[PDB]
């Protein structure tokens, strides 16, 4: 036999260092930390990572109008990753600094009423999390072993500090959504190469 | 420095306010168990389970998120079946829900059972 979709994913995530957590583990994140190394760096349970990507994917696909989902990254590594992720699901990409007030302030030129919000890291993308808590906006976030999980509905346990990890997760997430929508047939061949998501340093 | 059934009921409220699934009650007693039966038959708690390693003994209660408050009235008054009405109004949220548990010589029971059986007794607590 060959590998299932899960196993190809675990192979890819294990190649992207997605399992590598940080030195700390938040008490809310401990339900995913499989164990701790002698170096003291925790290990993320890649098993649990997979269903949360599936859980996140089922939430995404039920959003009937994708332009009404927003995806964001404060850090520079997630810029190219989230920009392409939006290009393929139809979401709305907001890369860089978030203008404070874009979910609460209705007279602001930039303004929105998203039904779903996907964030690269709660610790660096704190401001949109705090804003979505004022607008009944549910939240999806990639959470490292020390991400503060306040106002976060679906936290995917995953390395979100790495150049390869961030782009790998979004590529892997965008794949799962397209399958459910039917734009990609059964049969994992998705000719969009994974390296497209990793950003380029000029 | 212990006076139990305050420790038990305050543990449940604190567990409930947080929204927990189960509570542990380290000292238990027959009085405390009979209070939980009254709570349970009225629908404010799920089942619960006694632990016997020997001792006063432990009990774990499973909470269903629909008890609002449960209190003990230490300094247990005597309560004729005639002033039930005055303790009802002071201590209960309204004339529609909520129960005052009174220990009476026909057993521990809620103030509703007390009127039907026409017994007064000594107040233990209330829940609603």
């Amino acid at each position: 036999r060959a590998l299932s979709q899960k196993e190809q994913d675990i192979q890819m995530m294990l190649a992207a260092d997605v399992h590598l957590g940080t030195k700390n583990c938040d008490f809310q994140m401990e339900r995913y930390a499989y164990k701790r190394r002698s170096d003291g760096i925790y290990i993320i349970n890649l098993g649990k990572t997979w269903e949360k990507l599936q859980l996140a994917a089922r939430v995404i696909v039920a959003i009937e109008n994708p332009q009404d989902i927003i995806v964001q990254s404060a850090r520079p590594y997630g810029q190219r990753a989230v920009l392409k992720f939006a290009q393929h699901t139809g979401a709305n990409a907001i890369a860089g600094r978030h203008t404070p007030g874009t979910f609460t302030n209705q007279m602001q030129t930039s303004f929105s009423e998203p039904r779903l919000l996907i964030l690269t890291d709660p610790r660096t993308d704190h401001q949109p999390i705090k804003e979505s808590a004022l607008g009944n906006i549910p939240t999806i976030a990639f959470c490292d072993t020390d991400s503060p999980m306040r106002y976060v509905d679906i936290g995917i346990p995953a390395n979100n500090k790495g150049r390869n990890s961030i782009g790998c997760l979004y590529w892997l997430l965008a794949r799962m959504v397209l399958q459910m929508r039917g734009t990609i047939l059964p049969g994992h061949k998705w000719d969009v190469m994974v390296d497209l998501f990793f950003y380029r340093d000029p | 420095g212990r006076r139990i059934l305050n420790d038990a009921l305050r543990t449940m409220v604190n567990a409930e306010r947080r929204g927990k699934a189960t509570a542990q009650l380290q000292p238990i007693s027959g009085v405390m168990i009979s209070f939980l039966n009254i709570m349970k038959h009225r629908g404010y708690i799920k089942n619960f389970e006694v632990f016997d390693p020997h001792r006063v003994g432990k009990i774990t209660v499973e909470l269903q998120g629909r008890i609002k408050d449960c209190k003990a009235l230490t300094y247990r008054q005597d309560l004729r079946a005639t002033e039930i009405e005055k303790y009802r109004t002071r201590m209960l949220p309204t004339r529609q829900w909520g129960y005052v548990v009174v220990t009476t010589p026909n057993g521990v029971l809620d103030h509703e059972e007390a009127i039907r059986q026409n017994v007064g007794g000594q107040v233990l607590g209330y829940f609603h």
């Binding site: 809310q28 949360k52 859980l55 089922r58 939430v59 976060v152 | 929204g19």
Partner: protein
């Protein structure tokens, strides 16, 4: 709630949090309602989904995430 004549007299029966059974009120703007899509067969989606509501109390605590995970573990 119900008149003792038969009529129901409340306006707005509220939602309750699916994780804590707390009432979700009109001004609880931290509350969220999630729709989890159902995948069925080839293609893997039709317009069937499960709806859960989360209290603003639960999200502020941080255990919104753990509750959704433990709530989505139901089989049907």
């Amino acid at each position: 709630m119900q008149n003792e004549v038969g009529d129901m007299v409340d306006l707005y029966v509220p939602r309750k949090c699916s994780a804590t059974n707390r009432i979700i009120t009109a001004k609880d703007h931290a509350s969220v309602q999630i729709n989890i899509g159902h995948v069925d067969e080839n293609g893997l989606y039709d317009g069937r989904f499960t709806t859960f509501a989360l209290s603003g109390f639960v999200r502020a605590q941080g255990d919104a995430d753990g509750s959704l995970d433990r709530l989505w573990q139901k089989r049907k």
